[PDB]
Amino acid sequence: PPVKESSFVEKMKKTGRNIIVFYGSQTGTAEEFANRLSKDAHRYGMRGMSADPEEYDLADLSSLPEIDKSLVVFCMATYGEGDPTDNAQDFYDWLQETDVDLTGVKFAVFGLGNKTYEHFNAMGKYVDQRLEQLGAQRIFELGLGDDDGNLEEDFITWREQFWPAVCEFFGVEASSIRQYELVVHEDMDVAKVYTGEMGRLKSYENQKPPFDAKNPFLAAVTANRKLNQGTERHLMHLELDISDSKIRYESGDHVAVYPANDSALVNQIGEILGADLDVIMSLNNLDEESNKKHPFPCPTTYRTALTYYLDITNPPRTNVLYELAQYASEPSEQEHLHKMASSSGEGKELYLSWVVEARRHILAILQDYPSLRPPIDHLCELLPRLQARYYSIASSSKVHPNSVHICAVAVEYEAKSGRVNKGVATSWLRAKEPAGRALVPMFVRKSQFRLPFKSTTPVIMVGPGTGIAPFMGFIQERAWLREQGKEVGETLLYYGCRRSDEDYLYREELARFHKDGALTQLNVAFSREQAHKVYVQHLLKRDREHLWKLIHEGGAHIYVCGAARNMAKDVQNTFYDIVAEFGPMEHTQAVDYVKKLMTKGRYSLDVWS
Numbered sequence: 001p002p003v004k005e006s007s008f009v010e011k012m013k014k015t016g017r018n019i020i021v022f023y024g025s026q027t028g029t030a031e032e033f034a035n036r037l038s039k040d041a042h043r044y045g046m047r048g049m050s051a052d053p054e055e056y057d058l059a060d061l062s063s064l065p066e067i068d069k070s071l072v073v074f075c076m077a078t079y080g081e082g083d084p085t086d087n088a089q090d091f092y093d094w095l096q097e098t099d100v101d102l103t104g105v106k107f108a109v110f111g112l113g114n115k116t117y118e119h120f121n122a123m124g125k126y127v128d129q130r131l132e133q134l135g136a137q138r139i140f141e142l143g144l145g146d147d148d149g150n151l152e153e154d155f156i157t158w159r160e161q162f163w164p165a166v167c168e169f170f171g172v173e174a175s176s177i178r179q180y181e182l183v184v185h186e187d188m189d190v191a192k193v194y195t196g197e198m199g200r201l202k203s204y205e206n207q208k209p210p211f212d213a214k215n216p217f218l219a220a221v222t223a224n225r226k227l228n229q230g231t232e233r234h235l236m237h238l239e240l241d242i243s244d245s246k247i248r249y250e251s252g253d254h255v256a257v258y259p260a261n262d263s264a265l266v267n268q269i270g271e272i273l274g275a276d277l278d279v280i281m282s283l284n285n286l287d288e289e290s291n292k293k294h295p296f297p298c299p300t301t302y303r304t305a306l307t308y309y310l311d312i313t314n315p316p317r318t319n320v321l322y323e324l325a326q327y328a329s330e331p332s333e334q335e336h337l338h339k340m341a342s343s344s345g346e347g348k349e350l351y352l353s354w355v356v357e358a359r360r361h362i363l364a365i366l367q368d369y370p371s372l373r374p375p376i377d378h379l380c381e382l383l384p385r386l387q388a389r390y391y392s393i394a395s396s397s398k399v400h401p402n403s404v405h406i407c408a409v410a411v412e413y414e415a416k417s418g419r420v421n422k423g424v425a426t427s428w429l430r431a432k433e434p435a436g437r438a439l440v441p442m443f444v445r446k447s448q449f450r451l452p453f454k455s456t457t458p459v460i461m462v463g464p465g466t467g468i469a470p471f472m473g474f475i476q477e478r479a480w481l482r483e484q485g486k487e488v489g490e491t492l493l494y495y496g497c498r499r500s501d502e503d504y505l506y507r508e509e510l511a512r513f514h515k516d517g518a519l520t521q522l523n524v525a526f527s528r529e530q531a532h533k534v535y536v537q538h539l540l541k542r543d544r545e546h547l548w549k550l551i552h553e554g555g556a557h558i559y560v561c562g563a564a565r566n567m568a569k570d571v572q573n574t575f576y577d578i579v580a581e582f583g584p585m586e587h588t589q590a591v592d593y594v595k596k597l598m599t600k601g602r603y604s605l606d607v608w609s
C-alpha cells in the first residue's frame with residue numbers, strides 16, 4: 001500500500017487544468033495514449049494532465065464537477081481473465097464497493113485489449129458501465145482498441161471523433177511543443193550519473209531487498225544451454241541464481257527481466273544523427289508541477305538511455321513520426337511522415353505497410369528517409385520506454401528454491417523492410433555466458449497458474465513448443481511430491497514440436513520423469529514428421545474417453561500454455577467436443593461446462609502473443 005497523493009481535483013484547480021486522463025497500463029501502451037490525449041487538450045483550448053490512478057483516490061471524482069468544463073478520461077488495458085492492470089486494482093475494487101454519487105461528472109473511456117482473449121476489453125467495459133451506474137454522464141462512446149488488429153489505428157480513429165465531440169459539447173475551438181527541456185552537464189561527479197539502473201542511483205551496484213519492478217535483483221546466470229538439437233532456430237535454457245535475494249516463487253509464476261538494446265544498433269543511431277552519445281544530460285519536465293521530472297532516470301548519457309531506457313526496435317507510433325516530420329529537409333519525406341497520423345487514405349496505408357508490416361524500427365526509418373535528421377535530445381523524449389520481458393519460470397521452488405529457470409526461443413527474423421530484426425531480450429539473454437559475473441536484472445510476478453492444492457488431483461497439461469516452460473516446473477514438483485511419500489494423481493503431458501531431432505525441448509529430462517513414473521503419460525505431437533500436421537489437440541481427441549473420466553469423475557485440472565488464438569482456441573474447441581460427446585450434451589452446454597471449469601479454477605491459461 002503506497003501513500004496516496006493529495007486530491008487530484010485540487011491539483012487540477014491549482015494548475016488550471018480541466019481534463020485528466022488516468023491510465024491502467026502494464027506494458028506502457030495505455031500510459032502512452034493518456035499522455036497523448038492530455039497533450040491534445042492544449043490544441044482545443046483546454047488544459048489537461050495524465051495520471052496514474054494508483055497514486056490517487058478516485059473517490060475525489062465526486063469533486064470533479066467543481067471545475068467548469070471538467071472531463072475525465074480513462075485509457076484502461078485488460079490483463080489475464082479480464083482483470084484490471086495492477087496499477088488500477090485499487091480503482092477497480094473501489095468501483096465495486098462505492099455507492100458515491102458522480103452526478104455532474106462527464107467522462108469517456110478508451111479500452112486497450114486484444115480479441116484473441118476470452119474477456120475482450122473487460123476492464124474498459126466495466127469502467128464505462130459502472131461510472132454511468134454511479135450517476136456520471138458519458139461524453140463520448142466507449143472505444144474498443146484491438147491489439148490483434150492494430151491498436152494504434154483504433155486510437156487514432158476514436159481520438160479523431162473524440163475531440164470534435166468534446167469541443168461541440170463544451171463549445172470550444174480547435175504548434176510543435178516539447179514536454180522536456182535539455183540540460184547538458186559539463187562538470188559533474190560520475191557518482192550522480194545513472195548507468196542503466198531502474199530505481200535509485202546505484203541500485204544495481206548496491207543491492208538491498210525487497211526486490212521488484214522498481215528495484216530488480218541482478219541474478220547471475222549460472223547456465224545457458226541450447227535446448228534444441230537442430231539449427232533451424234535457437235531455443236535456450238537459462239538458470240538465474242536468486243540466492244540471498246529473499247525472493248519467493250512457485251511454479252507457474254513469471255520472471256521479468258530488463259534487457260539492454262543491441263549496442264551496434266545504438267551506435268548507428270548516434271552515428272546517423274551525427275550526435276555524441278557520451279554527452280551527459282537530463283531532460284527536465286517543463287511543467288515544474290508534475291511528479292514526472294524526467295522521461296527516464298537522469299542525469300545520464302544518450303548511450304545509456306538508448307541502451308537501457310528507451311525502445312528503439314518496435315515500429316514507432318504515428319505521433320512520434322508526426323513530430324519528426326519537422327526535421328526532414330526533403331519535402332516529399334516530410335509529407336510521408338506527416339501523413340502517417342492520418343486516420344484513413346494513403347497515409348494510413350503507408351503507415352500500416354511501410355512501418356508496421358515492414359517492422360521498420362527508428363534506425364530503419366532514419367536510413368530510408370535520409371533527409372530526416374532530428375536532434376538526439378528530442379528523439380529521446382519521443383521514443384517509448386524499454387519494457388521488461390516476462391518468461392514462465394521453468395522450475396519449481398520446491399526443488400530449486402534459489403534458482404529461477406527460463407525456457408525461451410530467440411527471436412530473429414527477416415522483415416519486409418529488408419533487414420534482420422533481433423528480439424531485444426532474447427538476443428541479450430542468448431549472449432549471457434555463465435562466466436565479471438553475467439547478471440540479469442530481474443524480479444518475479446505472481447500469477448494464478450498453479451498446481452492443484454491437493455497432490456491427488458489429476459493434472460492435464462497442454463503446452464506446444466516453448467509452451468512447456470511452466471510444466472517443467474510442475475513435473476519437477478509432482479515428481480518431488482511422489483518422493484515425499486505423498487499420493488499424486490495422474491499427471492499427463494501433451495507436448496508438441498516439429499521433429500524429435502530438431503526442437504524436442506527437454507527430451508532427456510522428460511524421458512526421465514516418464515520412466516520414474518512422475519509422468520503418467522508423455523504424449524508428443526511431431527507436427528512435421530509426416531505430410532499432415534499432428535498437433536496436441538489431435539492427441540487430446542484420441543484420448544477423449546480417458547480425459548473425460550479424469551475431468552468428469554477425477555476432478556482434473558486442465559492447463560494450456562503457449563504462443564497466441566489458434567492453438568489455445570483449437571484446444572478449447574477439442575475439449576468442447578469431448579464433453580459434448582461424453583456428457584452427453586449439446587454443443588452450447590458443452591461450452592458452458594468448460595467455461596464453468598475455468599471459473600471454478602479447473603482450466604487455467606497462460607498464453608502470450
Ligand SMILES: Cc1cc2nc3c(=O)[nH]c(=O)nc-3n(C[C@H](O)[C@H](O)[C@H](O)COP(=O)(O)OP(=O)(O)OC[C@H]3O[C@@H](n4cnc5c(N)ncnc54)[C@H](O)[C@@H]3O)c2cc1C
Nearest residue numbers: 389390391392407408409411413423424425426466469608
Ligand atoms: C506472460 C508471458 C509469458 C511468456 N513466457 C515466455 C516463455 O516462457 N518463453 C518464451 O520464449 N517467451 C515467453 N514470453 C514472451 C517474451 O516475454 C517475449 O515477448 C519474447 O521473448 C520476445 O521478446 P524479445 O525482447 O526477445 O523480442 P522483441 O524485441 O520484444 O520483439 C518481439 C516482436 O517481434 C515481432 N516478431 C516476432 N517474429 C516475427 C516475425 N517472424 N515476423 C514479423 N514479426 C515478428 C513481434 O511483434 C513480436 O512481438 C512470454 C510473454 C508473456 C507475456
Ligand SMILES: Cc1cc2nc3c(=O)[nH]c(=O)nc-3n(C[C@H](O)[C@H](O)[C@H](O)COP(=O)(O)O)c2cc1C
Nearest residue numbers: 025026027028029030077078080082113114120121
Ligand atoms: C498476460 C497478458 C494477458 C492479457 N489478457 C487480456 C485479456 O483478458 N483481455 C484483453 O482484451 N486483452 C488482454 N491482453 C492484451 C492487452 O490488454 C493489450 O496488449 C494492451 O494493449 C496492453 O496495454 P499496456 O501496454 O498499456 O498494459 C493481455 C496481455 C498480456 C500480455
